[PDB]
Amino acid sequence: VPPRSKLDSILSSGLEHNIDHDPLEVWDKGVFLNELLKQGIALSTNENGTLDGELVADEGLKKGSYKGTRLALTEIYSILEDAAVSHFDKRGYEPIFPVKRELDLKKRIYQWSDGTDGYPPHLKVDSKIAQAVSFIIPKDIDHENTPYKGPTLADVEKFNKAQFPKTADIMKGRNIGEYDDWYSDARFAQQHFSGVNPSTIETASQDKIKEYISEAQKQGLDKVKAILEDGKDILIQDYSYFREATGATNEQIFQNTVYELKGTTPTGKTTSRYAAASVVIFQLHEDGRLHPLAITLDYKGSLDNSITIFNRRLSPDDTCDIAEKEDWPWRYAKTVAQTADWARHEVATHLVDTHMIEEAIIVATNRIIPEGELLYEILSPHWFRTLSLNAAARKLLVPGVIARIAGFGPTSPSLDFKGNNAFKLIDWSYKNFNFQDKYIPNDLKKRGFDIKGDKSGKYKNYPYANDMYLLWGIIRNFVKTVIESQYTSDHVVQKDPYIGGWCKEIQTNGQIPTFPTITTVEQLIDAVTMCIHTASPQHTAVNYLQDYYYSFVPAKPPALCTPLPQDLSALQGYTEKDLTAALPIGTEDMKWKDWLLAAQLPELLSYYNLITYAKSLYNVNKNFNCKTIKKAAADFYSHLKSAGVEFENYSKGQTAGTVEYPVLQP
């Protein structure tokens, strides 16, 4: 059977393989650049070939697929980050090829933004893009075989499960929908210990516990009152600050009216979205199961002014005639407290507390500390291509996406970047960051977690805490060794020319007054440790599981699609139809779009580990004191790997069925 035939019998015959059975996983960048040109999603230019400032196409795309558009955003956003990298190379903000530059020059390159943009103090950069990403998202899409179709929970649950691959990176493949009881008190609350935002829960202030005891009396629950009065390890996740941050009064309601645009000027058609300044009360039991006791939907100064609901179950083992799955008021209350934990996570805990706090310290360090010095050499490796990425996020993620799907507004789009709430929240979260308080060891004390001395194993279900305590120590231990090699006494630090003006540059221009004025060896070691902790394990801790928790929207949605129930009465009268009405499920209210973005957001952000750092730092110092450095590395390398085992134990050590925390694994 010669090649002559072999070719013909393949051309002649009907297709043996159906292209539709094989789903498109990643783009031919060349094909996709043709399509962005074909569709006029490109920069327009004059005769002389200089930029207009407008795009080629006047209007966006008409029809598309969820599947297809999800991919098209992933890609356009990658291309945008490539652009950002190539730019910061040209502007020399982050040069690709190395270049020696004297401090005196780097002050003229690394210059602060002025707040014009509506963001905190970040590197200056020498809306128009946000247009292009809208143009990618069609007017309307084919709703058949999408993950939001429903129109009921069971329907989207069935779809969600179907998308998982056949027989930590395996975890990556799926989401929380894998668990049938994702909605459960147990799994809802464990998200506050081992989720994407496990660092903001704290012990409940007497002042609040009083408020709730007082509210519990009024609703008539002697059981709940007794528990709170006893007050055995009552915890809190308090989003009440949202109002204070946005400057909204107790009589206002968080809302975002989404104006639909035909190219530039709106159609007059609008969608509305609602977020609440929720509050949650938990109890941590002797066995270590964290359990929710109360949710204030939206907190407006007091619980007299607020809609508050208490759990029917007062214990992990407590049983009620109504099953968790059918308790629609509670399930709603929990869905609200997830829209709260979405904003706090995505805005404060990720974007500010790791990315923007960082960018400031980087600018300070680049302006103040010369490329030679020890500090610069142990820090700058952890800041590889951070500035260029942070930019693509300023010019897109917040305005184009976080501002869109979130229930803050007051309007989408908003020309006024100031006066927009999201930005006011970014601004507030930035100012009320506390550099020294988010040193792990302090963090755990302030919030009320005896991780040091507890042998009771009530913290068995809090692996973030147990992992970070351990890991923080190992990083501090590495930092300690290295810093001493030059800073043997508090004098050396005090006479060091750069450290004084460095601590200053940050506290002033960086607007991080909580950053220490370092004099001691201890103070330097902590600050340097924090910077790495922030640049790696923390970013990782609050970014690695982002898809898993957020991609199944009904488990953690970004904002509500129905105004809050007007009072408690209403709330208790809620049914499945009320809960589904609040979610972005079905065709109406342009809910298809929110689902796409809300689920897309992780993939945008999920786009460089410690072991490789150590290995690399060792393999250069094999030739301050470079040998002491080398040791630091080869111990650090070991300490991590040995701690890596201890991490996987805390993951197993959680009570029956409690999902893994595999996040800080080498």
Added chain:
Amino acid sequence: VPPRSKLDSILSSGLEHNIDHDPLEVWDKGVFLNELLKQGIALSTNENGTLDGELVADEGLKKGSYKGTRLALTEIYSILEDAAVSHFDKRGYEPIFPVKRELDLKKRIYQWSDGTDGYPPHLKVDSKIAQAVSFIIPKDIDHENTPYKGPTLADVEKFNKAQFPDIMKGRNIGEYDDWYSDARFAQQHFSGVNPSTIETASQDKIKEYISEAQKQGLDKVKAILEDGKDILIQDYSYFREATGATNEQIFQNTVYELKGTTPTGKTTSRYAAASVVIFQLHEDGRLHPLAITLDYKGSLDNSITIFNRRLSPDDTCDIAEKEDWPWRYAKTVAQTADWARHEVATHLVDTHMIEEAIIVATNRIIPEGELLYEILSPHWFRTLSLNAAARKLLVPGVIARIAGFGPTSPSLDFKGNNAFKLIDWSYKNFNFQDKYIPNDLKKRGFDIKGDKSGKYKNYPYANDMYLLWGIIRNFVKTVIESQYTSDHVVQKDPYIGGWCKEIQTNGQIPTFPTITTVEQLIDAVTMCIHTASPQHTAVNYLQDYYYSFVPAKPPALCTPLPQDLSALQGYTEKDLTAALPIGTEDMKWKDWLLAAQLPELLSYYNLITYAKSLYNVNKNRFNCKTIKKAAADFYSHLKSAGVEFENYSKGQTAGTVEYPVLQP
């Protein structure tokens, strides 16, 4: 045991894990940017902060490790390609974010180089770097537990095998104990990195060899050649003509060692030959070598020629293949020949540089909208920026270095350097139409269409490409017709005439067709894809496997050719090992590093994904639906052909190494 203890019991206790047991596989880019700065391998700048044109450090690195330096080159070269990409973005040669630009503008951006650089016609770009890569390569390295230490074949063979853990990717030809064997040497001309240049032997040569065979006194070999049943040839004799060297000269490269800039006076010498090989393809399909002319100087009267003791795959001799040191040497020489021809002509010119020209022509001539531009430009993603980093480094910094052409390394005069003269010659004697697969196979003398004898069973490149070429042409056919239904349309098409012209003139590819027919367009467009993907892949995918075990395919000799035939036959293992880059002396450690490094540099994007992608954009409300079909058939045709490829891999005679190269 609380976390308090768990931390203590890790700090307190002796380290459970020794960092030295875990070798460094990949760099923290941040650490490595600090080290390149620390070591002054960086661009220097004045008070005013503009570039000098010199680097910070005056001198290079003192000591390093083969392992460590191999990695440090891999990385610095990656950083260099990133730089090139970011630059072509700034200069808008290849913009990262899309931008509509009118043809009239693209003529002002996409402009031809002038030959100053010593290279053929390529995009203009708005030594200094080659300095930085030298600075990475130390003065001398620790020779202990390196793959060149030896000091004998068995020694480096034992090391080579030890390093083995996409599975194929893990290892190299050393996996086979009889890598040196007639069988495996010759199969490299059918299923190696250069399987497209072997051809049927001209009567004029077969006469020459019959004549030489008579003189040496081998009635056996004479009878075989006179009978002349499927005699093939791999003829490198053109090297002299290309470099313009006379039959009285010897190819040599005197490598001057530098202390930063000005040389130390210390030199190494390297020698290449314009070899010729004669094979016979047997009924069963085993290709078998019969003769090697070490270096061909006008005739075999002037040249050292050697005939194989074995006149057949099954033929046996009292001396084993493994101990036949003259033959093994002769074969090692004919590999230095196939190294130059491969790395220079078959890869760098025939795929990368021919391409760059057509890209420039297409960008200058055809507007971004047009059908041609849309089906072509996807196959040229980030090609121009990469091609640049190669001009500014691979040739001068590496190919020119390890190759035995010179005449000097480094050479200020880019012209007058032989490598460049060979690039130049290979470029001019390319034939766009003749390297259409179907023609290629006919000219060279391969009835792949009609042969049912299965003598071509051991030539999977041929059988795979014939099949694949057809499937690509079939896809191209469908798409082109959707706009070009008749030869008229093509003839009146404004751009095609001036496009074919732009190439034949400015691109210096006169062999590129003046297209009038539908057939002519379809072939040209097919060739461009064939060249941009399966061909580049065919002659680049196995580069590590064949080249990384240097004694199997070394880039140049480290001993002058034996003076005459007498000498050659008097060769022993010690002569063969003397020619290779093994041991400490003659700075042979360095050649091994680069020669083995070269693949990994070029190793830095398949058809299925193309099809899938082209389908998933043309699924919406020329004709886009006909396009979409073309895609969803092409998608299938590939996958179905993908099976047929793996059959030809199995279909090779016992033990003949796989050809897995065109696998989706």
